[PDB]
Coordinates of all heavy atoms in Angstrom, one line a residue:
Chain A
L134 N -16.9 -13.1 12.0 CA -16.7 -12.3 10.7 C -18.2 -11.8 10.3 O -18.2 -10.9 9.4 CB -16.2 -13.3 9.7 CG -14.8 -13.7 9.8 CD1 -14.4 -14.9 8.9 CD2 -13.9 -12.5 9.6
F137 N -18.5 -7.9 10.7 CA -17.9 -7.1 9.7 C -19.0 -6.7 8.7 O -18.7 -5.9 7.8 CB -16.6 -7.7 9.0 CG -15.5 -7.9 10.1 CD1 -14.4 -8.7 9.8 CD2 -15.5 -7.4 11.4 CE1 -13.4 -9.0 10.6 CE2 -14.6 -7.7 12.3 CZ -13.5 -8.5 11.9
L138 N -20.2 -7.3 8.9 CA -21.4 -6.8 8.1 C -22.0 -5.6 8.7 O -22.8 -5.7 9.7 CB -22.4 -8.0 7.9 CG -21.8 -9.2 7.1 CD1 -22.9 -10.2 6.9 CD2 -21.3 -8.9 5.8
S139 N -21.6 -4.4 8.3 CA -22.1 -3.1 8.7 C -23.6 -2.9 8.6 O -24.2 -3.8 7.9 CB -21.4 -2.0 7.8 OG -21.5 -0.7 8.3
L142 N -24.5 -1.6 5.2 CA -24.4 -2.6 4.2 C -25.7 -3.4 4.1 O -26.2 -3.6 3.0 CB -23.2 -3.5 4.5 CG -23.1 -4.8 3.7 CD1 -22.4 -4.4 2.4 CD2 -22.3 -5.8 4.4
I281 N -24.1 -17.9 2.4 CA -23.6 -16.5 2.9 C -24.7 -15.5 3.0 O -24.8 -14.8 4.1 CB -22.5 -16.0 1.9 CG1 -21.2 -16.8 2.2 CG2 -22.2 -14.6 2.1 CD1 -20.2 -16.7 1.1
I404 N -21.3 3.3 1.5 CA -21.5 1.8 1.7 C -22.9 1.5 1.3 O -23.1 0.4 0.6 CB -21.1 1.4 3.1 CG1 -19.7 1.6 3.3 CG2 -21.5 -0.1 3.2 CD1 -19.3 1.5 4.8
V407 N -23.4 1.9 -2.7 CA -22.6 0.9 -3.5 C -23.4 -0.5 -3.3 O -23.5 -1.2 -4.3 CB -21.2 0.8 -2.9 CG1 -20.5 -0.5 -3.2 CG2 -20.4 1.9 -3.5
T408 N -23.8 -0.9 -2.1 CA -24.4 -2.2 -2.0 C -25.8 -2.2 -2.7 O -26.1 -3.1 -3.3 CB -24.6 -2.5 -0.5 OG1 -23.4 -2.2 0.1 CG2 -25.0 -4.0 -0.3
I419 N -23.2 -10.7 -6.2 CA -22.1 -9.7 -6.6 C -22.4 -8.4 -5.8 O -21.4 -7.8 -5.4 CB -22.1 -9.5 -8.1 CG1 -21.3 -10.6 -8.8 CG2 -21.6 -8.1 -8.5 CD1 -22.0 -11.9 -9.1
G420 N -23.6 -8.0 -5.6 CA -23.9 -6.8 -4.9 C -23.4 -6.8 -3.5 O -22.8 -5.9 -3.1
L421 N -23.7 -7.9 -2.8 CA -23.3 -8.2 -1.4 C -21.7 -8.2 -1.4 O -21.2 -7.6 -0.5 CB -23.8 -9.5 -1.0 CG -23.3 -10.0 0.4 CD1 -23.8 -9.0 1.5 CD2 -24.0 -11.3 0.7
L422 N -21.1 -8.9 -2.3 CA -19.6 -9.0 -2.4 C -18.9 -7.6 -2.6 O -18.0 -7.3 -1.9 CB -19.2 -10.0 -3.5 CG -17.6 -10.2 -3.6 CD1 -17.2 -11.3 -2.6 CD2 -17.2 -10.6 -5.0
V423 N -19.4 -6.9 -3.5 CA -18.9 -5.5 -3.8 C -19.2 -4.5 -2.6 O -18.3 -3.8 -2.3 CB -19.7 -4.9 -5.0 CG1 -19.6 -3.4 -5.2 CG2 -19.1 -5.6 -6.3
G424 N -20.3 -4.6 -2.0 CA -20.6 -3.9 -0.8 C -19.7 -4.2 0.3 O -19.2 -3.2 1.0
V425 N -19.4 -5.4 0.5 CA -18.5 -5.8 1.7 C -17.1 -5.4 1.4 O -16.4 -4.9 2.3 CB -18.5 -7.3 1.9 CG1 -17.5 -7.8 2.9 CG2 -19.9 -7.8 2.4
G426 N -16.6 -5.5 0.2 CA -15.3 -5.0 -0.3 C -15.2 -3.5 0.1 O -14.2 -3.1 0.8
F427 N -16.1 -2.7 -0.4 CA -16.1 -1.2 -0.2 C -16.1 -0.9 1.3 O -15.4 0.0 1.8 CB -17.1 -0.6 -1.0 CG -17.0 0.9 -1.0 CD1 -16.0 1.5 -1.6 CD2 -17.9 1.6 -0.2 CE1 -15.8 2.9 -1.5 CE2 -17.8 3.0 0.0 CZ -16.7 3.6 -0.7
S428 N -17.0 -1.7 2.0 CA -17.2 -1.6 3.5 C -15.8 -1.7 4.1 O -15.5 -0.9 5.0 CB -18.2 -2.6 4.0 OG -18.1 -2.8 5.4
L429 N -15.0 -2.7 3.7 CA -13.7 -2.8 4.4 C -12.6 -1.8 3.9 O -11.7 -1.6 4.7 CB -13.0 -4.2 4.0 CG -13.6 -5.5 4.5 CD1 -12.5 -6.5 4.3 CD2 -14.0 -5.4 6.0
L430 N -12.8 -1.3 2.7 CA -11.9 -0.3 2.2 C -12.0 1.0 3.0 O -11.1 1.7 3.1 CB -12.1 -0.1 0.7 CG -11.3 0.9 0.1 CD1 -9.8 0.4 -0.1 CD2 -11.9 1.3 -1.2
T431 N -13.3 1.3 3.4 CA -13.6 2.6 4.1 C -12.8 2.7 5.3 O -12.4 3.9 5.7 CB -15.1 2.7 4.3 OG1 -15.4 1.6 5.1 CG2 -15.9 2.9 3.0
Chain D
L429 N -6.7 -6.4 3.5 CA -7.6 -5.3 4.1 C -8.4 -5.8 5.3 O -8.8 -5.0 6.0 CB -8.8 -4.9 3.1 CG -8.4 -4.2 1.8 CD1 -9.8 -3.6 1.4 CD2 -7.4 -3.1 2.1
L430 N -8.6 -7.1 5.4 CA -9.3 -7.7 6.5 C -8.5 -7.6 7.7 O -9.0 -7.5 8.9 CB -9.7 -9.2 6.2 CG -10.4 -9.9 7.3 CD1 -11.8 -9.4 7.4 CD2 -10.3 -11.3 7.1
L433 N -9.2 -4.7 10.1 CA -10.4 -4.9 11.0 C -10.0 -5.9 12.1 O -10.5 -5.7 13.2 CB -11.6 -5.5 10.2 CG -12.5 -4.4 9.7 CD1 -11.8 -3.6 8.6 CD2 -13.9 -5.0 9.3
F479 N -18.2 0.2 13.3 CA -19.1 -0.9 13.2 C -18.5 -2.2 13.8 O -19.2 -3.0 14.4 CB -19.7 -1.2 11.8 CG -18.6 -1.5 10.8 CD1 -18.2 -2.9 10.7 CD2 -18.2 -0.6 9.9 CE1 -17.3 -3.2 9.7 CE2 -17.2 -0.9 8.9 CZ -16.8 -2.2 8.8

Side-chain angles (χ1 to χ4, degrees):
Chain A
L134 289 169
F137 300 166
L138 297 186
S139 193
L142 170 84
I281 284 161
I404 296 166
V407 158
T408 317
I419 277 81
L421 177 61
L422 182 83
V423 162
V425 169
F427 186 73
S428 161
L429 289 196
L430 178 74
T431 57
Chain D
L429 289 196
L430 178 74
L433 270 71
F479 61 83

